[PDB]
Nucleic acid binder design. Structure first.
Lengths: 152, 150
RNA sequence: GAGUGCGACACCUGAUUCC
DNA sequence: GGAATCAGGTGTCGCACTCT
């Protein structure tokens, strides 16, 4: 178990073997600490892609948190897409019929709508962790997602 | 060792620990009791790619020392072979960017190797997994020997 | 509306060598 | 298993132009 001031630190990550190929396998992973009862690594239900696993691994961590009555959180993910989406983009997407900058429709709307819904009632600091650069937290969350993508 | 007027040479690098004291070696073999057969220490940052590349570099300097311009080069470093026979064309065109849009790490090394190849007619031969070729084994022996000497 | 670049962070597939 | 390294891909977005 780890913390920064009053915020408990959590790591999330998604993965997907054969992303954009013929047989995609996507998984989610959240790491709270060594041997933490809350660490999970499971198979991502639905459309298999890296983007959804990254968004959905972040959703899982928040659900778990509410489950522990946690309201302050530092969420580390190596997914700028997830971050930018939830902390910038969704705001504008809501005032424009969910439309890309190329007049078309935002592909992960349901993933971001599900995410934003979870963020109600949560002071969360979305911090980017560079992937594959020695951050135990992020390697483990990646380890956990790979294991989860090896499932159901 | 000659394939016609083309003379044959074997090159190889090595680097164990590739974490603590990455030690890198360079070896170039021309044949039984040849005055230019050498095993020496890789200068600079120690990696396997750098030793394989500078092993080729070393051999080409030696060829020139012998007024050789048609050279057949044997190495098991497909990375070296690919950078020099076909990737450098694109890197000099795209500002030395990788397919992932990042910077070519061994840029310095390939530029030096490319410089040495001006005026050289060189055939790059990949020596596979494992074959006989005492040439490759010798070159290997040379590299591991040069692996220790600052 | 159609399209083309560019940037960024991920997610991969593959290959050879060095351990 | 890992490192050193590269080539080809998709997943997705914003940003910046141009319509033969």
């Amino acid at each position: 178990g780890s913390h920064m001031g009053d915020f408990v630190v959590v790591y999330t990550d998604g993965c997907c073997s054969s992303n954009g190929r013929r047989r995609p396998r996507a998984g989610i992973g959240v790491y709270w600490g060594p041997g933490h009862p809350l660490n999970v690594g499971i198979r991502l239900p639905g459309r298999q892609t890296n983007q959804r696993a990254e968004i959905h691994a972040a959703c899982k961590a928040i659900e778990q948190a509410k489950t522990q009555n946690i309201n302050k959180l530092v969420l580390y993910t190596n997914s700028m897409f997830t971050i930018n989406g939830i902390t910038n983009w969704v705001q504008g997407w809501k005032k424009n019929g969910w439309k890309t900058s190329a007049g078309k429709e935002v592909i992960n709307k349901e993933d971001f709508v599900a995410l934003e819904r979870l963020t109600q009632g949560m002071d969360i600091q979305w911090m980017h962790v560079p992937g594959h650069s020695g951050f135990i937290g992020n390697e483990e969350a990646d380890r956990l997602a790979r294991e989860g993508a090896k499932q159901s």
